[PDB]
Design a protein around this ligand. Structure first.
Ligand SMILES: Nc1ncnc2c1ncn2[C@@H]1O[C@H](CSCC[C@H](N)C(=O)O)[C@@H](O)[C@H]1O
Ligand SMILES: [Zn+2]
Lengths: 176, 300, 76, 179, 352, 107
């Protein structure tokens, strides 16, 4: 699936294969043009490079968030810190969960029927923490907010490499 | 910790401002607000004279290292250099446009610092009485100024919670220690070696800031100091006691080894604003405000 | 003939030379063993400046004696 | 005098720069040269061009010491190159700290902070008949913020510009609402 | 910082200054004058500390003691007195041959003073009584000898007007080490003054062919008697040719200052590399008298026509000593601050 | 018979010392030419050359160029005060002028 062009921060290294993103200095949260509304949709975040001192905030942020927003600023955006899992949300400090290794396959999922949510930190089909509860209906963009130039890819194929176990979803060849 | 009353210096007819010991440790001086600076002894309170010749009131009186020369922080916006052995107006020196509260000498006795109310902290001359330097320091009346042991540093306390260390030779600011609270900082002074500064703030808590690093070490609790500007001292003869005046008709003496209520003296009838410690002996002065007008000599 | 050279710092070199060797050979051996450049090897024999173009059978040098290497400084 | 315990003991101010004194072509920045020829000489000139003193208008202000000519450069507004959402945290933060806003945006992407880091281009007051303005120029890819002039400015006159709430400007063309 | 650069005022308080010296810590400055007056300043307070009337005839030599409480001088009247800084009274006084050059305490003991008369031999004295030991001179023909103690106090270096340096042991007069200075091709040159550092073994010889030679204090002890050492560093001026007047070392013995006897300038070299680093000019038509150096801080005190100048680094200040939470930058700096956007120690306070 | 070291390297310069000494000997200035005179004069010529090329390279950088043409030498000389007093009666070819319009001519 192709990325966006004008609803984003162009100073990042949207690399020249149109399928791989590289970050820069600062949490300039680039967000894709395929935000969830209803049904069931999932993709992966495939790490091909992760140097040290590279915190990678991953989550789901609304169109109401800033293009330069920290992922974890408000009620409209979650967070998951690499240092002791200490997530920050509505300016709340809670030492909560664990970290994440190098070169793994990431990817988060939410289930919003036409509601009741399934918001758990999804890593490799393994529980990493029940995050939050009872959001409102709306749009949530794929949030890529990196600290350094860690080259990570992204999988848009229906043949996922680490999906959640027993997931009800739809193939990604219908959004773009 | 066995201090008992010996004598009582009486004769001051207004609120007693401050009493200080001579540097040789033989002459506890005295003053008041009635334009009368008396000269008393140390071991019995023996009368010598009463220094005057002014036009308006008197705040404070400084010393000389040989216990001879004096200056008066008068309240006619002037600087009158005095003398113990004669009692003569040696140098009549103007220089300020408001009153003066604190004034001190460097240990080599050639400069006069004068933290005033028109906020021009000046450095005067002793031999000729000429103005020498000028420091645009504060936006508040300066409460305390002090030199270190050698004489290369000047400290300054204010009302907005600021302390700045000033240079003697060049004369610019070097270190500013910051506080989130802003009480009127009443009386700062150096350590007796010249490597620490003891700060007195108006939140009923004293603080001992380390000089070069820039953080505090230990505090004091259990004293009453909210309205006025109460002095403090050090003790090197016996224990590590810290002598200060009191508002609730007491004498505030405690130890940083204790950090708790371990000794209180009692007997005053007004707010003791100024205490003084003796360099070689265990002699403690304590002078109160207008409802007492007496001085209680404590002695171990 | 193993004579010695002690400097002013307190270090003594152990040179297992022959009684008929040259100076630049000693310079090359010191370049091999120490890494110190030979641009300062002014040896002192009874206060006299030993000339650099000499041998050991010239100054009537006693065996297992002590010479002295004094460092010099130049370079801008 | 040791007894009259009075008010006016705290002011809650960062700068105690309000002093007792408050004593308020040929050059390359005034020539018609291209822009990086002027921008290089700018920072060497701005140390002797202007200064900060006690302004009668509102707090402190920028006061020249030398005759600025017409249409030349005066000083650069330079501080932290932050992005436009840390500005919200700092607005609420110094709302809790009571410190005012020093936030010029270069464009609709990033904002220059002048609270923790900056130079003497903070202390320029607001007015309605000003004598200075601003542009955004290009020096080797990066962008900068230069305060120009509008007419010949005499030694002692205060420099002001339009920032774009009751104000103490007092000018005849006042608006009385600065938003 | 390092070696001074800017002119920085003067001390135009008492006229007709002639010579100057510092103590070990550099807090006092004794200066003799043209009528027997010794004025002491301060550098901790930048003010005059004490003025003591000495004599009626001028003073041409001064030396501080090790404790700092005793001075000694050598006026025109052949007077060598152990003065006081507290009372200020002459104690000892006895006449010499009428020109006297230099006096100097022993660097460890305030009992031994080394007086160098002009037309005589060096005389080592005592101060517990009136003993005097006339030191031996090799040539005994010219009688123009300068001498001084070394740094620690173990030896005394002596020099004649023929370029023959001798080493005498400080108490038993043991002529153990000697050399003749290799001046050009064949001719020998005079010796004007000998000075020693404050840290180490190096020293300098001021000859009369206008070249300053920097030796090492251990090569002489290595070479022994009648050896031939060569200098570590040869320093001169060849444009103006500059006959020198006075030399001394820096604080830790790293730099060398050398005042001029013709043009009123001061030249500063390095000792390690050996290159000229700065020339400090001044008033164009004066005449130079003395050069000093502050032992822990870069201050030079040059006397010229009674005016003492002080080259003292030109302190220029800034902000951020007033507001410590602020950093006054110069150009733009981009960053974000953090990657996550939201004991009983009893120390002696009266220890000196 | 030793290794030859040119007199420029012995003084730490970049201009030649031997060529300056020859041009003083073969130029009818005096009979005898001292030893330190070409070293002094080559040091002075190197200082003035570096002093003008600094400013010319700065102007060439500010015009978004890599090389130096005579316009940048013109701007560098005419903007400095003391280089302008030294090169006062000198025409530099292909140089142009400085922008200067009088005050009473523009509306
Ligand atoms: N001319 C003016 N009249 C009233 N308020 C002004 C003003 N110019 C600036 N201000 C206010 O003051 C702030 C600028 S900072 C003012 C100068 C300096 N900080 C000082 O007082 O010492 C802004 O928040 C603005 O709201
Ligand atoms: Zn207004």
């Amino acid at each position: 699936v192709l990325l966006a062009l004008h609803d984003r921060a162009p100073q990042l290294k949207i690399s020249d294969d149109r399928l791989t993103v590289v970050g820069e200095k600062g949490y300039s949260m680039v967000r894709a043009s395929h935000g969830v509304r209803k049904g069931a949709w999932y993709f992966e975040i495939t790490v091909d490079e992760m140097p040290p001192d590279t915190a990678a905030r991953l989550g789901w942020s609304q169109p109401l968030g800033n293009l330069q927003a920290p992922l974890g600023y408000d009620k409209f955006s979650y967070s998951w810190r690499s240092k002791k899992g200490t997530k920050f949300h509505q300016s709340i400090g809670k030492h909560y969960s664990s970290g994440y290794g190098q070169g793994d396959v990431l990817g988060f999922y939410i289930n919003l029927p036409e509601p009741h949510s399934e918001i758990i930190f999804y890593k490799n089909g393994v529980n990493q923490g029940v995050a939050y509860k009872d959001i409102f209906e709306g749009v949530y963009f794929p949030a890529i907010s990196l600290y350094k130039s860690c080259t990570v890819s992204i999988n848009f194929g229906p043949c996922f490499k680490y999906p959640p176990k027993d997931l009800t979803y739809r193939p990604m060849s219908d959004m773009g | 910790p066995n201090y008992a009353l010996k004598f009582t210096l009486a004769g001051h007819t207004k609120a007693v401002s401050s009493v200080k010991f001579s540097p040789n440790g033989e002459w506890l001086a005295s003053s008041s607000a009635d334009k009368l600076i008396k000269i008393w002894g140390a071991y019995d309170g023996k009368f010598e004279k009463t220094i005057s010749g002014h036009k308006l009131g008197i705040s404070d009186v400084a010393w000389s290292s040989d216990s001879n020369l004096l200056v008066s922080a008068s309240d006619d916006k002037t600087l009158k250099i005095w003398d113990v052995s004669s009692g003569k107006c040696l140098k009549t020196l103007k220089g300020h446009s408001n009153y003066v509260f604190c004034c001190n000498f460097n240990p080599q006795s050639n400069l006069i610092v004068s933290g005033s109310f028109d906020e021009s902290v000046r450095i005067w001359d002793v031999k000729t009485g000429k103005c020498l330097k000028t420091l645009p320091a504060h936006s508040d009346p300066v409460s305390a100024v002090h030199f270190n042991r050698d004489g290369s540093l000047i400290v300054s306390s204010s009302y907005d919670g600021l302390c700045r260390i000033w240079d003697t030779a060049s004369g610019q600011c070097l270190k500013t220690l910051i506080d989130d609270d802003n009480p009127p900082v009443s009386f700062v002074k150096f350590s007796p070696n010249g490597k620490y500064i003891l700060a007195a703030t108006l939140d009923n808590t004293l603080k001992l800031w380390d000089y070069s690093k820039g953080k505090c070490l230990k505090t004091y609790t259990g004293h009453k100091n909210e309205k006025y500007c109460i002095f403090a001292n050090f003790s090197v003869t016996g224990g590590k006691w810290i002598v200060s005046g009191s508002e609730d008709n007491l004498v505030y003496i405690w130890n940083l080894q204790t950090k708790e209520i371990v000794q209180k003296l009692q007997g005053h009838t007004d707010v003791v604003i100024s205490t003084a410690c003796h360099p070689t002996e265990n002699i403690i002065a304590s002078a109160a405000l207008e409802n007492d007008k007496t001085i209680k000599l404590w002695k171990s | 003939m193993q004579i010695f050279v002690k400097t002013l710092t307190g270090k003594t070199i152990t040179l297992e030379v022959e009684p008929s060797d040259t100076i630049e050979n000693v310079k090359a051996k010191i370049q091999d063993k120490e890494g110190i450049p030979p641009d300062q090897q002014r040896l002192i024999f009874a206060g006299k400046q030993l000339e650099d173009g000499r041998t050991l059978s010239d100054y009537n040098i006693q065996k297992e004696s002590t010479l002295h290497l004094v460092l010099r400084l130049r370079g801008c | 005098a040791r007894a009259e315990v009075h008010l006016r003991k705290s002011a809650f101010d960062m700068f105690n720069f309000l002093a007792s004194k408050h004593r308020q072509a040929r050059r390359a920045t005034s020539m018609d040269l291209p822009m990086p020829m002027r921008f290089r000489h700018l920072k060497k000139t701005s140390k002797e061009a202007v200064g900060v003193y006690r302004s009668p208008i509102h707090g402190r202000g920028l006061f020249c010491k030398r005759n600025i000519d017409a249409g030349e450069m005066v000083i650069e507004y330079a501080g932290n190159v932050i992005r436009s959402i840390q500005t919200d945290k700092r607005e609420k933060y110094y709302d809790s700290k009571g410190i005012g806003c020093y936030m010029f945006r270069i464009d609709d992407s990033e904002v220059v902070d002048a609270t923790m880091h900056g130079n003497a281009a903070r202390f320029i007051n607001h007015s309605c008949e000003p004598n200075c303005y601003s542009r955004v120029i290009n020096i080797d890819g990066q962008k900068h913020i230069v305060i120009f002039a509008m007419r010949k400015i005499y030694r002692g006159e205060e420099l002001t510009y339009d920032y774009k709430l009751p104000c103490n400007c007092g000018a005849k063309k006042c608006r009385k609402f600065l938003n | 910082q390092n070696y001074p650069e800017e002119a920085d005022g003067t001390l135009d308080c008492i006229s007709m200054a002639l010579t100057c010296t510092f103590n070990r810590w550099g807090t006092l400055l004794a200066v003799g004058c043209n009528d027997g007056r010794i004025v002491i300043w301060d550098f901790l307070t930048r003010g005059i500390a004490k003025i003591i009337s000495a004599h009626i005839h001028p003073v041409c030599s001064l030396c501080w003691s090790r404790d700092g409480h005793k001075l000694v001088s050598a006026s025109t009247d052949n007077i060598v007195s152990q003065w006081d800084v507290l009372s200020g009274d002459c104690d000892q006084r006895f006449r010499f041959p009428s020109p006297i050059l230099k006096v100097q305490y022993h660097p460890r003991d305030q009992n031994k003073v080394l007086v160098c008369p002009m037309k005589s031999a060096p005389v080592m004295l005592t101060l517990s009584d009136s003993k005097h030991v006339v030191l031996p001179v090799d040539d005994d023909s010219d009688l123009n000898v300068v001498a001084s103690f070394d740094r620690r106090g173990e030896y005394i270096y002596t020099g004649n007007a023929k370029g023959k340096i001798l080493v005498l042991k400080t108490d038993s007069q043991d002529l153990v080490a000697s050399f003749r200075v290799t001046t050009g091709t064949s001719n020998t040159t005079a010796i004007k003054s000998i000075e020693f550092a404050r840290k180490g073994s190096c020293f300098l010889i001021n000859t009369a062919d206008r070249i300053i030679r920097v030796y090492d204090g251990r090569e002489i002890l290595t070479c022994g008697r009648d050896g031939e050492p060569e200098p570590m560093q040869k320093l001169q001026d060849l444009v103006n040719r500059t006959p020198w007047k006075k030399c001394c070392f820096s604080g830790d013995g790293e730099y060398i200052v050398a005042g001029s006897a013709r043009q009123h300038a001061l030249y500063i070299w390095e000792k390690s590399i050996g290159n000229l680093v700065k020339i400090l000019h001044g008033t164009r038509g004066e005449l130079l008298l003395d050069v000093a150096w502050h032992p822990v801080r870069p201050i030079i005190a040059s006397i010229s026509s009674g005016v003492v100048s002080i080259w003292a680094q030109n302190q220029v200040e800034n902000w951020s000593a007033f507001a410590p939470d602020f950093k006054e930058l110069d150009e733009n700096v981009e960053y974000e601050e953090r990657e996550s956007e939201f004991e009983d120690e009893e120390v002696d306070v009266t220890s000196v | 018979r030793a290794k030859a070291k040119t007199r420029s390297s012995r003084a730490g310069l970049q201009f030649p010392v031997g060529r300056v000494h020859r041009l003083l000997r073969k130029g009818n200035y005096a009979e005898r030419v001292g030893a330190g005179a070409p070293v002094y004069l080559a040091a002075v010529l190197e200082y003035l050359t570096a002093e003008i090329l600094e400013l010319a390279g700065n102007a060439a950088r500010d015009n978004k160029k890599t090389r130096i043409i005579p316009r940048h030498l013109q701007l560098a000389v005419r903007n400095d005060e003391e280089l302008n007093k030294l090169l006062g009666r000198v025409t530099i070819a292909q140089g142009g002028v400085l922008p200067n319009i009088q005050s009473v001519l523009l509306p």
